[PDB]
Amino acid sequence: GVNEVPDYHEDIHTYLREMEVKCKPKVGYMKKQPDITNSMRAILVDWLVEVGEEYKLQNETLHLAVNYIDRFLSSMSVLRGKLQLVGTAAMLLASKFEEIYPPEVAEFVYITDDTYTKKQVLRMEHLVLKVLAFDLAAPTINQFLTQYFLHQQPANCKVESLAMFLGELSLIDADPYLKYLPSVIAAAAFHLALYTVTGQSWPESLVQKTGYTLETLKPCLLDLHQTYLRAPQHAQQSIREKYKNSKYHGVSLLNPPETLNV
């Protein structure tokens, strides 16, 4: 029906693929960041996952926050002691943008264990807007995914939950996901889940939509297969903890395929 916006689903997809290029963080901004590291960013993003889970925020919100963070850190030197304050500020911004009932500012100050005051959280908010110049409507993985989900035949909660799961795993690891577009990552995660749960593969319907072939999607699909395989051994574990729950059908408990047969 109109909930699938028949007349506008393609126009929207065009625009989001253009905007995704425009909203893109600088690959390896971390090398230019004297004091913070990729490992540090992994601790942050993982913490954001927990925060979304505690407050029951949308998954869209989580992806927005991460975009907000990487773009900000793309242009603003940040000392480690201030890393969490950037991320708090972003979660707040993403919440305000995306949620019907975002948590209060006080709740964003509670989750920092009073590392920061309410006025630091708010001053960072204005700074973040200034640096991003209010460009907050950033396309995400989840946003492509949900469209890709429309081409299923039939639908599979497991694949859905499992495609979601894999997309999110990407957020944690700047290397190597800063070098893929949200659209590409989402294609890769959709294949990889579909395969695992059904044995099926990137649909032709979606080859016609995206212009992406399993050939185009292989550099990514390999990095994410590896990510999926070494996931139980990653230092960061909130995503897996999250997708063990039954809301997600315990897809973190399913076993990665061993070979993708490419």
């Binding site: 909930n3 699938e4 916006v5 506008y8 625009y15 943008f97 209010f134």
Partner: protein, 285 residues
Amino acid sequence: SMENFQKVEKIGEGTYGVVYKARNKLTGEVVALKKIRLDTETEGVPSTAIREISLLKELNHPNIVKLLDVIHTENKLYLVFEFLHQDLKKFMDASALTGIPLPLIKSYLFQLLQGLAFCHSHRVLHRDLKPQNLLINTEGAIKLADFGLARAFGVPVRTYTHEVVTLWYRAPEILLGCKYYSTAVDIWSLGCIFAEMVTRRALFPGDSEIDQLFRIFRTLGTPDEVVWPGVTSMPDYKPSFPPLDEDGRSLLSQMLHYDPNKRISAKAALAHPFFQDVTKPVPHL
């Protein structure tokens, strides 16, 4: 900071903020400045402002009001809009006795539909289309404004905020508490607004939710299969309305179809027979 803007008069308040009319002292450019008070010890920058600013930066179309600049201070935020002469409501009221020429109604509708089709093409719901949020200039243009209840949507759409659209302009799916709603809701509004340009009275002026729905249930007709239409399962009913040519009446009832999935899209409406002859008259101000 705002030393180059010189204030002229107040021109009202909308979803949020006070809007004044101003002149750039250096270029002579007349503008409108929405002034948004920030709560710098409390909630910081309002969610409504974050949405309007961001969404209105994406949206560059001649039938959508132009954000020009955004001036930050530590305690204030000022949105600099292009200035338009007045709103559809005020024009409709000045036009209460004379009427609005049927050519202009087409023009205004057409522009509104181009405008809104542009929104929908770009992942945005306006969600508060009402004559007071539509601005006209002296040369026959009309533009969507007040994007404070706007929202970037995903595909398919999720449950969004229930508290949306002024009652009169609110589509039935929202009234009935439907888990989902979509681009349908904005069309419904333009459908209500189409009618209001013709007659200059609002089409569904309810005092309450209950009254708002009964005015639609009536236009629908008498029962066929689904007996009480006050059900989240949108039954299939399109209204009847027997100075609007046969085409006009069709377009309207397509824009006001009770089932959201069958309601015309903005894109579709743009190609309707109604607009074959459509031109661009100037208004009588």
